[PDB]
Amino acid sequence: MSFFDLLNERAKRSLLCVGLDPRAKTAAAAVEECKRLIEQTHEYAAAYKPNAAFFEFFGAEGWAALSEVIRAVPAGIPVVLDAKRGDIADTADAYATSAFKHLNAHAITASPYMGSDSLQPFMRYPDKAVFVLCKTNKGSNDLQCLRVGDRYLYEAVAERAEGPWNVNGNVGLVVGATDPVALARVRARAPTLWFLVPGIGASLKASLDAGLRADGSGMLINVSRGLARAADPRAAAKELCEEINAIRFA
Amino acid sequence: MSFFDLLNERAKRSLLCVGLDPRAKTAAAAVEECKRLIEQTHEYAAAYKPNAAFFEFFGAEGWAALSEVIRAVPAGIPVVLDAKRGDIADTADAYATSAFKHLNAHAITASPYMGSDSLQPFMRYPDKAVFVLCKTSNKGSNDLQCLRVGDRYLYEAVAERAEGPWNVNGNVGLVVGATDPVALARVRARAPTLWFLVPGISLKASLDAGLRADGSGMLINVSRGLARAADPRAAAKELCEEINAIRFAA
Lengths: 250, 250
Prior knowledge:
With about 250 residues, chain A is α/β, with parallel strands linked by helices.
């Protein structure tokens, strides 16, 4: 089962991605915190997204904690390591081996800035997925909205992803929820790719109308604070999952 | 004791940055390998650049190994953690705290793709430097970096931002490859004062294109050329002296 095999099975029930961004002060407490959130939300989760930086923060024990948390994700539910990596050759190979073999995540996020051969070391794993940063925060304007001919830079990234980068059919894009016009533009350039969509908790219907594919799928909607800090995380995930599906059905 | 205070002092003697990219198969062996290379090269090193991916590869033991290797670098020689990070908000804050406080590196490398607010969490440390990816030498450089924005390349637009709006704390540098001196000269034209971290040496042409008016502002990284030299001590001495001979020449 590839990442997308697992995701497409989950997508029959949910498009909700649950962020694992522990607020705990120690690695041990972080593990327990994440395990509890998994227990409460897995029935309504399409994926989990552990925060690579939050785990690195704990130092030595942080790695082990991340591995333990990934192990705690029920079989059948894919894990996207939000590590936003980008380098080349042996260095990129080492990041990919760490994420995919050592930590056993099913997917990673990656920067497009160094281009095709910076992305190849991740994308060469046919059973893993690579979500490439496309449209994201206020700094988006700096580079992403620069005009490269008759399109924005973020559109140029989209055209490569739904295009020559997708050798193993395992490329996705990171496309933010807070900009529905941009979301629609990316979907027009890349009509078949899965989007990882953060920032809903920073409009649900607008995002889905702009970003869903023709099949009513293809958006993985990430929520972190709205679930982790909820009075009832299970009920919050259930409600979000159902809200998304109601829109898909209509 | 800022990064640039340390670097300016070292630049009186050297512009050589020594990569720490261990080939060893265990964390413990990697530490010893790096310690040996530091011992052989420190008299001629302006900086050390540990490979964040290579240390992450060793998992739990990896972080501790990286911490130990950084601590092994003589007082007075700055450490650039080559991590190429880029994220937003609390996540970027976590990467910064990890690199600058927990690991006690003096500088980090970072992707520009998510723009100003993705870089601010690193740049807010006035005593730490942030080397932002600008122009890299790999084939993928064609994909984004060499796209045309108005009458210039994307990498020139990045250089302008870095020299201009981004450099509020005077701690921004750029990563600029040695393999194209024409591009290196374009970057120096857009960014007359910034330090460049220059991987992958074309030594004379690179220095002619990239040095500032003061004969400084380039940090020349060497990895394989030193670590795999029969005599790394003599290799570092020779490279340091060759760089300086070019700097001295009218």
